[PDB]
Structure 1
């Protein structure tokens, strides 16, 4: 019922914006306040924080969400560490953006519920769209 998104890059940003457009409540989190303010209006609660710190996480009240999307990209370690902490906080559904096959491998082992490869997935979706038009 509740949606939280950590990592306001192109992916997470897009996700927070749609959820908002569909009239849902979203908790948008990100380290540098640049982003956190750029999505303040498109979110129900924008917060500057570091997902890799358990304390900032609990103070964030993250265990009160059923769906937490980790959209941190470049930094595989932060991404990995974050989903690991979330798994401990016992979040029911944690979806994570993966950067490659191995990042994907460990995410599985750590316990991620859904691993997303944005560019690859879009590619298969685009190829399908191509068939669907002669």
Structure 2
């Protein structure tokens, strides 16, 4: 099918190899630290001690055999940039790299990393949103303006109805799901009961939702 190589068994890298392997893919786990390789031995199709900045060592892995190579070295900029440069030079189709900061992202961009990820910064802003707005449990941005948000229902909604407390007429948003005591009602039909601490999944404009949050909850 398709073959994966995870260079850098960080908390990020190690989670990718561990997941991809649980999904039952072909994953090569690479790390310069022996102890890290030994640890992920059981959680990878394969584990190998190698310094990803040395070319001959990368060829020994048969890196050219991989469709996707992930460089999850995010603390060492020098290790990361050199490795990704090697990978691009060795004509790897998809190179996904972890970046440290804006500048590291810039170097990776210029040496042709195919997709760059800031796992910490991204999770940072998402957690910050949940801190600031105690109502938002989780969310996904469709664009800069429009977003799907999962909200914890306050007592301000306990035993309330949809045909009653409408959103798309009143706020221009649409409710997609309700989760009461673990049970899930997708594409719910008005009227439905919403209890307190229910997961309410709303969808629309980012500003529109926060207006509903203010006045509805």
Q: Which TM-score applies when normalising by structure 1?
A: 0.92
CA separation of 1:41 and 1:116: change in aligned 2, threshold 3 A: same
Q: 5+ residue gaps in structure 2?
A: 132-217
Task: Tell me how far 1:120 sits from its aligned partner.
Answer: 1.7
The alpha carbon displacement at 1:94 in A equals 0.2
CA–CA distance in structure 2, aligned partners of residues 68 and 121 of structure 1:
21
Q: Measure how far apart 1:23 and its partner are.
A: 1.1
Report the Cα offset of residue 19 of structure 1: 0.4
The 3-state SS of whatever aligns with 1:58 is helix
Greater share of residues in helix: 1
Aligned residues: 130
User: 1: distance between equivalents of 2:130 and 2:84?
Assistant: 32
Partner of 1:39: 40
| Corresponding residue for residue 56 of structure 2 | 55
Structure index of larger Rg: 2
Q: Following the alignment from structure 1 to structure 2, what is the Cα–Cα distance between the partners of residues 41 and 128? A: 37
Q: Secondary structure at the match of 1:10?
A: coil
Query: Residues 66-117 of structure 1: CA distance to partner in whole angstroms, max 9, x if unpaired?
Result: 1000011211001000000000000000000000001000100000000000
**Once superposed, what is the RMSD of the aligned Cα atoms?**
1.4
Structure 1 ranges of 4+ moved more than 6 A: 127-130
- Taking the aligned partners of 2:13 and 2:108, their CA distance within structure 1 comes to 18
Structure with the larger strand share: 2
Aligned to 1:93: 94
Shift of the alpha carbon at 1:61? 0.2
Q: TM-score, normalised by structure 2?
A: 0.57
94-103 or 119-128, which moves further after superposition? 119-128
The farther-off stretch of 68-77 and 120-129 is 120-129
Quote how far apart the aligned CAs of 1:124 are. Answer: 4.5
**Structure 1 alignment gaps of length 5 or more:** none
The alignment partner of 2:12 has SS state of helix
